[PDB]
């Protein structure tokens, strides 16, 4: 279905084998599937086509909301409440977006494990790799803010991590 972007949710080309019967007995699942196709699938298809005909007579659209990019917490003065409010709201929206990205990657990982079958450990190394890097980034972003989190606390965490990295490079270059 075209209801979703197939590059965000990749899927292998779906190779399936040909039915090559080697016995002379009838296949029960074939007859059962024919009965299913002509008895339950066709009425459902008819009902869905009626529903689609009804929908075609009334077509309206809903639009995805787009937000401007406002200055973030680093460009706000210490006690400027309005810039602080806008930056905090933008940070909350970015946090939700990052959570949804992690959800997308997790969905890929789950789908991949089931789809591959018994060879999943070697079959989808890439999904595991993608999830490891995304999880590491999300952890380094939001790991230990706890409740009452804010853009200021994330900024302080980033500043502390940058100081640690700068010191590590300082004593790394001295060797």
């Amino acid at each position: 279905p075209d209801s979703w972007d197939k590059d965000v949710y990749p899927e292998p080309p779906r190779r399936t084998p040909a039915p090559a019967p080697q016995t002379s007995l009838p296949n029960p699942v074939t007859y059962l599937t024919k009965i299913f196709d002509l008895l339950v699938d066709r009425p459902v298809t008819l009902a869905r086509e009626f529903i689609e005909q009804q929908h075609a007579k009334n077509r309206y659209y809903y639009y995805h909301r787009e937000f401007r990019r406002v200055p973030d917490i680093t460009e706000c003065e210490e006690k400027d409440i309005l810039c602080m409010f806008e930056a905090e709201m933008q940070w909350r929206r970015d946090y939700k977006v990052d959570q949804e990205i992690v959800n997308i990657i997790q969905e890929r990982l789950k789908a991949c494990q089931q789809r591959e079958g018994e060879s999943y450990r070697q079959n989808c190394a890439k999904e595991l790799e993608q999830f490891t890097q995304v999880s590491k980034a999300f952890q380094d972003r939001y790991s230990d803010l706890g409740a009452h989190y804010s853009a200021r606390k994330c900024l302080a965490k980033q500043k502390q991590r940058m100081l640690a990295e700068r010191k590590a490079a300082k004593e790394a270059a001295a060797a």
Partner: protein, 52 residues
């Protein structure tokens, strides 16, 4: 209960899904890591002078 069930999505969950889809598509197309461990770019962070 019917009113509560059909409340408009003001918590903005589908909006977050669509924004994340857009960003993942853009970052997968151009070889970006899909997330960086730095929320704010260091070009506008002013750390103290030196370590010591």
């Amino acid at each position: 209960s019917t009113f509560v069930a059909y409340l408009p999505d003001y918590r903005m969950q589908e909006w977050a899904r669509r924004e994340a889809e857009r960003l993942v598509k853009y970052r997968e197309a151009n070889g970006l890591p899909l997330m960086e461990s730095n929320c704010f770019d260091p070009n506008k962070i002013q750390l103290p002078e030196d370590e010591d």
